Amino acid sequence: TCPFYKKIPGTGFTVDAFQYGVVEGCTAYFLTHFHSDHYAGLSKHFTFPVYCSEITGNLLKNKLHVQEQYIHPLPLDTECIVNGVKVVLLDANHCPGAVMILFYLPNGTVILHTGDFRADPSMERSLLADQKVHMLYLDTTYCSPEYTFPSQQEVIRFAINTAFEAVTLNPHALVVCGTYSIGKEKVFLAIADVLGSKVGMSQEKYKTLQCLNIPEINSLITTDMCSSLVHLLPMMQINFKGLQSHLKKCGGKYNQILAFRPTGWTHSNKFTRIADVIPQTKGNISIYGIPYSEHSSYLEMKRFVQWLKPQKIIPTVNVGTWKSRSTMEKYFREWKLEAGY
Template sequence: MTTRKGKGKASGLKQTDIGVFFGLKPLKDKGKEQEAGNILPGVSLHQGPVLEERKGGKGDHGGHQTVGVHRLQVREGGRKRWNRGRINGEQRESKRCPFYKKIPGTKFAVDAFQYGLVEGITTYFLTHFHSDHYGGLKKSSTFHIYCNRITGNLVKSKLRVAEQFVHILPMNTQVTVDGFKVTLLDANHCPGAAMLLLFLPDGQTVLHTGDFRADPSMEAYHELLSCRVQTLYLDTTYCSPEYTFPTQQEVINLAANTAFRCVTLNPRTLVVCGSYSVGKEKVFLALAEVLGSKVCLSRDKFNTMCCLESERIRQLITTDWKAAQVHVLPMMQLNFKNLQTHLSRFSRQYDQLVAFKPTGWTFSQRVEAVEDIKPTVHGNISIYGIPYSEHSSYLELRRFVQWLRPLKIIPTVNVGSWASRKAMERCFSEWLTEAYEANNVKGI
């Protein structure tokens, strides 16, 4: 087996390096169902047929933790795939689970809760706490969910799923789940977001990125350096050349510098940052630190942040609106009417407001650099739309794939049309060809 050598640690991106959800507008709606009859088996470097199914076997080699699996009581035999009955309170599979959410040769499904109980699946992984991934989970759910601690905290706190069904896996530590070796790696996406590195008994290695933003620090993950990934399930939200946008740090610096300048010129400036239930933490924490202020959150958002188990964050957040110069509001409230109303509530402290809307949806191709981004202004209120994305840009995807050089790539986003699938296939083929030519690798 080919290996990469290096001393990098998978903790290069820590869970407390908080990310956000959302980025630039994708070509198709994220999570759109795959068209019936159109299967994208991935891009393979093998000239022969690609094996979709892999044989199981004994894979516990010792030296790592073992996690027991509580199997769902699903009756075997005679059950049709489209049966809408219920088992143990869960609806049976009501619509077909896409192939890219299941790992061949295992009984694993990834982010597949909206399909009810999936035939042949006993173990359900949740890569992160965003609704398009945990959709289908509710208080009465009896799926046995495997995730890391942050995501588990959010599932139990926000969805009220019973603790007995939430199985916490450590980060950067190989464990055994249902007889298969599994390692969770930081996905650089949002709090608790994880990639799944799976080692199958037949020697195959699978990496499922979930949602992620590829970062050069991942090239130092010793778990990836020490193995050869055959199959890559890839977050292809922005797998098209037009999706080129700034790094997170560039955008954070823009927001921090702008806020600092505004407050320096007028100390009575209130700074507002938009957010989702989970997301935008890096931005508003940076604003608080540069201004030497706390961040005020709604009680619900405050409780969510406490699930992240970060002492640094706990010291920066408050629910006292008058005790903080940085306020976090729901993204949908960031318009002039709502912001004027919000500012008027604190007129004794502030007479100006600058707001940051950190979502790639507002990014314009006409802007060559983040420094060129201008606010929309109405009276004493300014709103900056900043291109802060938690999904990989096209160039970041290319770099990651060319570094990893998997034998097969399976896209997990924008697979709903034949045209988008073929376009992604062409990208993968070009990237891998370039990578192998650059490394003088033969036989592709």
Template sequence: MDEEDFEYIPLMKKKKKNLVTEDKKKKEENTKKLSRNQKRDKNKAQNKVESTPSKSQGTTRQKRKTPKSKTPKRERKKYDGYCPACQMPFSALVIETPTWHASECIDNYKPESECSEGADCDCTIQSHFWRFSHKQLAEYRQRKTRADQIGSRTNKGSKDKTNTNTSNNNIPNSSNNSLSIKSKLNGAIPSQLSSTESCDNVVREKNLNEVLMNSMKKSASEPCIDLGATSKDFKSALVKNATDILMSSVNSKHVKEKESLPRTRKIITKDDKELQNVLGIENSGKGNQSTKPVRNCPFYKKIPETGFTVDAFCYGNVPGCKAYFLSHFHYDHYRGLTKKFSSPIYCSKVTGNLIKSRIGINPDIVHDLPMNTPCTVEGTEVLLLEANHCPGSVLFLFKTQQGRLILHTGDFRADPSMEEMKCLQNVRIHQLYLDTTYCDPKYAFPPQKLVIEFGVSLVDKIMTEKPKTLVVCGSYTIGKERIFTAIARRFDCKICVQRDKYKVLECLEDPDLSARLTLDANETFLHVLPMGKLNLQGLHEHRSKLRTDYNNVVAIEPTGWTYNDKMVSLDQIKPKGNKEIKIYGLPYSEHSSYLELKRFIQYIRPDQILPTVNNGNPATRRKMESIFESWMTEDKAENKPKQTKIGAWAK
């Protein structure tokens, strides 16, 4: 027998022994598992028996292991109370705060009709309250709050007597007058207080009668006042005071929300006095006291030596102003003008039609001045010139009694045709109020006529390739009319506008344009929509409302802000959108470009230039001053004054 066989046999015996031990271990583990499972089943059965409630014992709720909860989502903040103007519950607000919503309602709330549900209206949709008024609901809530107040007073009992005894120490002892006041408090509340009382949850702890009583407790020396029929004026003033107190209590609960509202103008620091003069802001606070800035009319809105202001309606009654001039009907220029305005307004015929029809200004105070015809206003000669901006926009050329010429451009698009105006030839312009919207070298967009011709040719090319195309032009309330009128003349078609735009265009008194207007969207392929609807969703919704089946939609967005300084030719314009809807942004502007401003100033060559746009930043003002000086010196004209600093104008 070899050595290899002798070594092999013992190895086999060892492996057999190992296999036997492994089998035993597996059997033991299986028995242990079975015993564990049996115990587990018994425990489950016992738990079920114990968890079932018996008739004698109360129900015991089985405790469950709560799984690890994820981070809870932030819930939307819900507000209590109702809007004082539209009666909408504040709980329906999603983004706005109650203070924000109430301020918007006070300014813009114009319901169409009364809600048919009356006092039973329980709607929580915001658009419903914007569309319908809820006077009956406000009266119902008013009566309810009064009843709650009376019930709360009667339930107090003896506590009220002790409180009244202590409070009467500050009031003169006059039982008859005090009784007359208490008996007539409920009658002293007019219907207009329903808006404030509707916020019952917000000012729940405020008692209207207590507020009225406290408002009369000014001093112990004053006699007690009877709210009889002979003192109606005082009663109304007293109720107004109580209303202010109630509204202040509502606003005090939303101080943090009020601070988060956007501010229209920043508070100016003390170091920048020049900027305060430019913006027309004076801080009435002393020391480090934080007071609201008082907005006075800035100097660049005033015409010196005349007592006139231009586009200064948001500053209230300007001291010393004899006449208010309006350059055109754009909101940033007529802001603050309401139908209650009573001072004389001077403007063009078209602008006068717009403010009378759109705002409801009293026609007696609107004075329409003719174009290119000198007129005398308060001893000053005024001449209106075409501004090439929007319909009705004008330049004001003032000639003071001292013989100084002052030119105010308002908003304008400088054009070489202005150099042919005889009133601007061979004259010395002492002061120029200049529209500097695009006073930056990067805004060198092409002339207006080239952009209009490109827009017409673009539509012509698309219509020849795809006849079933809907053409949409963007527009403001007034402005951008030259684009869609040029397209309408090329195709000799109608122009579909919305009813609001139709009323605006009627004020232009243009017979050719009026003959092309229509409200029927299915009568023409050329439509005019607001700029805000020139997006994929807005254009898709507009097309879906039409009976005519259009395969494609082409929208033209005419604005100078679409201009890119890398653009060399208009042919480089590429649309945005998809295969069916394409939006072309044309660099069409109704403000002067950088090069057009340069040519205009080098032609006018005024003694002083004052920018009326983007003049709030000191760095921007210094940049514009250097630009003006470079333009004036570039022509190398002799004996011409240099541009002075803008801050010197305010001194």
């Protein structure tokens, strides 16, 4: 049965609620972004209206084969009427096509559903500036003060410098980057740009990237692996056994691998600076874990919420344990007492 935090009161609407069958009373199913925990349940046999971004709609049609007649893409930053209710989609600074949704209820209540997001001060000058929000449905993935990580720009700088140094020392080195979902495309695109290479990948991953409206994409990616010195592989294959096997496959064109695993947070974040990160090495293979996040840090989350000053907060992540729920409620109250709302 559909949990309460996926339902929007006073409407016929649900958010990211596709794995519960026909939800009673739901006239429109919103999808915030194309990540499997959120779309779980959608397939080519779905026959209710799906509201989403243009990019999410490209992926539903091409990857899941949802039929066109049930896909309703909306432009961002634009007041739209859906089944009699004003809505706006905002960029969530998550993966390509990810949105936050503002609902303007007929009784006067305003609700923000962040989907998954990485809060940024630029959101303080979006259409959120213009009116009060009563209820916030919040991505609380990293709602604890131990969760620190650097900016995306610092992480990309480390990756570009690491890759460029290694390949300039050894022109026969190969760079490999792990992936298991959309998101974090800047990692492999920035590295290939500094190396003067296209990124090589499987036909299935190429297909996915071609749905993303990335400018000049045909100039940046390819299915011809052997012409490329940046390869993408499934995240599961980024280990010594998997990479040894991959090195065989190139016909001794390459004699060293430098591989990147963009994780979210790992506890090495509490002691080590990005500058000081070191790989795991075996022989001619080195693996870097780099903390590239597409969710808010604790400080970025706190700043957003203290700026927005919502009347009520509904977490959408870490809701399964009493200890989690109590921890999150404590921080929400600190924040409200410190700022005075």
